[PDB]
Amino acid sequence: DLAGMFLQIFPRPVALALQQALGQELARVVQGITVRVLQALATLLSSPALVMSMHRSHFLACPLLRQLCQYQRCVPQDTGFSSLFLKVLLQMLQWLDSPGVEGGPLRAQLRMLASQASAGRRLSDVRGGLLRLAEALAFRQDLEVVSSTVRAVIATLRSGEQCSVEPDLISKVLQGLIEVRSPHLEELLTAFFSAKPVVVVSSLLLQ
């Protein structure tokens, strides 16, 4: 069955048939089995491994994860598939974070998928998130956390309205981000000044 299918693939043409079936399902859905295989994979991940076999055979696992993510992107309103996909991605991240496994394309692909999943959600408090960014940038540590929080702030500014101004706070955050040289500076400035900006920019330039 699908659990036996997984235990036959990773520990080869049957995986090709599975890929063809997933592509057919994707074409059918975009024109108008994925949930079954995802649930089988989740239940197999619950029990004890398979992740190490997917690591040694990433050329099998990574196309499957790509197909599942494209399914998720095609129909994002089908909640339950996306939550379970995020759950299994985090489960694999937990199971692959050990130092002994060293690098691997599979880890990077899963981390990219997790970051993509976490970027499509809002954040409640603009002031709270900006203060979080202020002290996180004060320590200059947890750069992945910094990037995720900036992405959340950008999404918040995209959807939400303008919170309290706090020009000193915003100037300090901008100066810190310039110092750390984050790639999200341009997006942050666009989102911020879409909503005083001249005084902030002039003060930053003078310093």
């Binding site: 592509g23 196309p63 990219m112």
Partner: protein
């Protein structure tokens, strides 16, 4: 002029002014070809540091121009910096641009100058399984170029990574029937042809992937993979016998409902039938003549198939 352009980029850092100045500096370096290494270093500095997406995009275009013009002048450090930039950027358009530059470089002698599991191979493996089809095409092109150009035995583990990435890209691009997907499909099939030439022991797996994917692909995709099979079987005709059954079956099922776009598919299928046939045809010939006479009033299709037969 170089000193003046440096003074301009530092003293007029507007988006328009810095873009025009950096492009002019790149063209001057290309024409003079003595400042070209430090011009590449400057462009990589602007790509890494400058946060403006427009400036990064210009830097990508200029580095692609320099890669096309003077790939030999690229150092290992330059390619390492470009790979690091591609690795740690969050934006997909920029990543696609840098991978276009790197795929241009990998097709040249710069890959030989670049040489283990380095940042380039790590990036290429990461990119060939990307959600973005263009990034996947560029990554798998880089992998194919490394595999066929470098026979070093320390990096034969990515030989199958290249094969499986090409196959997954086939599965991704076959159903879409969109011009961008068709472009990525052409890139993947060109890479497969190149890989079949460079590493003939992988030819059987490539042919098997193409044959299995033929039965579950759209008509335009089917035509492109028929061209790929024709190329591989022209260079390596031993594989022709193994592909005749699938091709003949698909020829039978296509000819029953061949309305408008299947005429190109018909000539492509007949072309691979004739190419893959080392010897003559007895029953396959009867099948082809029957398929032509049953429905095909299109004389042009018959003429092109006869051209291929002769």
């Amino acid at each position: 002029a170089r000193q003046l352009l440096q003074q301009l980029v530092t003293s007029y850092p507007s988006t328009k002014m810095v873009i025009v100045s950096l492009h002019t500096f790149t063209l001057l370096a290309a024409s003079s070809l003595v400042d070209t290494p430090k011009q590449i270093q400057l462009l990589l500095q602007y790509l890494k540091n400058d946060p403006r997406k427009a400036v990064k995009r210009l830097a990508i275009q200029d580095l692609k121009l320099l890669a096309n013009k003077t790939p030999h002048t690229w150092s290992r450090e330059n390619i390492q910096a470009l790979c690091e930039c591609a690795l740690q950027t969050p934006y997909d358009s920029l990543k696609l641009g840098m991978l276009s530059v790197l795929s241009t470089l990998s097709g040249t002698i710069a890959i030989k100058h670049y040489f283990r599991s380095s940042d380039l191979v790590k990036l290429a493996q990461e990119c060939c399984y990307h959600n973005n089809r263009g990034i996947a095409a560029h990554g798998v092109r880089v992998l194919t170029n490394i595999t066929v150009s470098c026979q070093e035995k320390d990096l034969l583990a990515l030989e199958q990574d290249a094969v499986f990435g090409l196959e997954s890209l086939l599965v991704l691009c076959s159903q879409d029937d969109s011009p961008g997907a068709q472009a990525t499909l052409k890139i993947a099939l060109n890479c497969m042809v190149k890989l079949a030439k460079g590493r003939p022991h992988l030819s059987q797996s490539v042919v098997e992937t193409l044959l299995t994917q033929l039965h579950s692909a759209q008509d335009a995709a089917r035509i492109l993979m028929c061209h790929c099979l024709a190329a591989i079987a022209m260079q390596l005709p031993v594989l022709g016998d193994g592909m005749l059954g699938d091709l003949m079956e698909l020829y039978k099922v296509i000819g029953r409902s061949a309305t408008d776009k299947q005429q190109e598919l018909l000539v492509s299928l007949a072309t691979v039938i004739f190419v893959a046939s080392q010897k003559a045809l007895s029953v396959e010939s009867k099948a082809v003549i029957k398929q032509q006479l049953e429905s095909v009033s299109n004389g042009w299709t018959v003429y092109r198939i006869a051209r291929q037969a002769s």
